[PDB]
Design a protein around this ligand. Structure first.
Ligand code: DRB
Ligand code: HEM
Length: 406
């Protein structure tokens, strides 16, 4: 079963053995599988003995509160189990303010709204190229053919890196979250650093207007950013916008493929696309990381112990029936779409603006060229669960005669 012995300070009545890496009824959909944590018989805050043992906040109120309170809930160990969150070094994911603030401001210079607005049409040009290449085929595995190539190519654009480096960079990042065995996490991480360091050092001396140049020439605490800090920052800027976007776009397209009326709504009402993007972000939320207790702390009537890890599923806030009525229903016209899909608090996703642009551009450009599409006949879509939950594959089909080259 792989259950760790219940710590003495944890009450038995709060035990609920949820496995974030293999939840029951995953076949019903990953968001639905996690939603079991919100059924009436489950407390607001529970302890699971799976994956080493850890707390799980199941309601939006608690999830938000914990993310706001970095003093008690530290990012030093954000992953479960502990012997993975202690190893990882990317900046500034494992830092708490004030330390985190300096690096966060610098990162915002490369992915902030001003930059996203400026690269807006370049992202569109990339989406159109990928979609046009698939259009005549009448079929594709959305995840492999569009979802994966899109974000990585956008990173190359952002970081001013050559297209020829994509296959290798993609492989290195793939090994960090989906290893085939050729490389350990440390080896993949170091391989990434071996690639980034030379570029960082060269652009420190002869800078451009790209993301790496900006980070390399950044300042931290009155002095210049070190090579170690720069590579760790660039590393997160790379990995942060890959799996999240790949899987999110896949969840969204899976829904649209199965929902003809929703596709038509966006075709007839293009102005609703941004709102649709927000509603999809709520319904198909997919991240679930955590924090570690800095000291003994009583939280909502529960005794938390220093060193205890707590999973705070960003995914769950928007699915909470206390926040949004009929949470499993996708309604593009909701007046108030509440969610913490991009996180909450000091670590709120720095790439949130880039992500929304990628989503909106994908939706508009795909529906413009391929308005009518469906899940391939006989195909059964499978999901996966973890820190970033997702879709294994998404075989889509369409009649080329119903499409149009634009
Ligand atoms: C290669 C790899 C990774 C890996 C992880 C990684 C993490 C995650 C921590 C390290 C991952 C780091 C991600 C880096 C990228 C990144 O930072 N993205 C960012 C970005 C996007 C979101 C949001 C924020 C911005 C923060 C972050 C996430 C957590 C657990 N394990 Ru699992 N694991 C971990 C350590 C030691 C052994 C081990 C095993 C052993 C056997 C079988 C499984 N595992 N493992 C794998 C699949 C399913 C279950 C599973 C378990 C289950 C229980 C116990 C161990 N293992 N494992 C294995 C290989
Ligand atoms: C749909 C897509 C995305 C989702 C759902 C998502 C979600 C998240 C979440 C939940 C966090 C905070 C985690 C925590 O509090 O520990 C986060 C952090 C971050 N994300 Fe994203 N993200 C997305 C896209 C992107 C993109 C496109 C980039 C581009 C580089 C990116 C860069 C980052 C960075 C650098 C951080 C760290 C912020 C900090 O620690 O201060 N993300 N993201």
């Amino acid at each position: 079963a792989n259950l760790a012995p219940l710590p003495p300070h944890v009450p038995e009545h709060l035990v609920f053995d949820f496995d974030m890496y293999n939840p029951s009824n995953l076949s019903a959909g990953v968001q639905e599988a996690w939603a079991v944590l919100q059924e009436s018989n489950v407390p607001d805050l529970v302890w699971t003995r799976c994956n080493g043992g850890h707390w799980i906040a199941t309601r939006g109120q608690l999830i938000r509160e914990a993310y706001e309170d970095y003093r008690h809930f530290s990012s030093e160990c954000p992953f479960i189990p502990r012997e993975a969150g202690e190893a990882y070094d990317f900046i500034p994911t494992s830092m708490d303010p004030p330390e985190q603030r300096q690096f966060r401001a610098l990162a915002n210079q490369v992915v902030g709204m001003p930059v996203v607005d400026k690269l807006e049409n370049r992202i569109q040009e990339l989406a159109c190229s990928l979609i046009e290449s698939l259009r005549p085929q009448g079929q594709c595995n959305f995840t492999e053919d569009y979802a994966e190539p899109f974000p990585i190519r956008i990173f190359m654009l952002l970081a001013g890196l050559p297209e020829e480096d994509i296959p290798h960079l993609k492989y290195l990042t793939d090994q960090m979250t989906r290893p085939d065995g050729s490389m350990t996490f440390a080896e993949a991480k170091e391989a990434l650093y071996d690639y980034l360091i030379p570029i960082i050092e060269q652009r420190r001396q002869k800078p451009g207007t790209d993301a790496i140049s900006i980070v390399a020439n950044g300042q931290v605490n009155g002095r210049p950013i070190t090579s170690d800090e720069a590579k760790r920052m660039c590393g997160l800027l790379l990995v942060g916008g890959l799996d999240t976007v790949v899987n999110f776009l896949s969840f969204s397209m899976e829904f649209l493929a199965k929902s003809p009326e929703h596709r038509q709504e966006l075709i007839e009402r293009p102005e609703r696309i941004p709102a649709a993007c927000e509603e999809l972000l709520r319904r198909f939320s997919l991240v679930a990381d955590g924090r570690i207790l800095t000291s003994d702390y009583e939280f909502h009537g529960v005794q938390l112990k220093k060193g205890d890890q707590i999973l705070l599923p960003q995914m769950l806030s928007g699915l909470d029936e206390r926040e949004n009525a009929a949470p499993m229903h996708v309604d593009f016209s909701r007046q108030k779409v509440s969610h913490t899909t991009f996180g909450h608090g000091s670590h709120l996703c720095l790439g949130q603006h880039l992500a929304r642009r990628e989503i909106i551009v994908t939706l508009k450009e795909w529906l413009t060229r391929i308005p009518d599409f469906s899940i391939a006949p006989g195909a059964q879509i499978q999901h996966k669960s973890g820190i970033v939950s997702g879709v294994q594959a998404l075989p889509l089909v369409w009649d080329p005669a119903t499409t149009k080259a634009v």
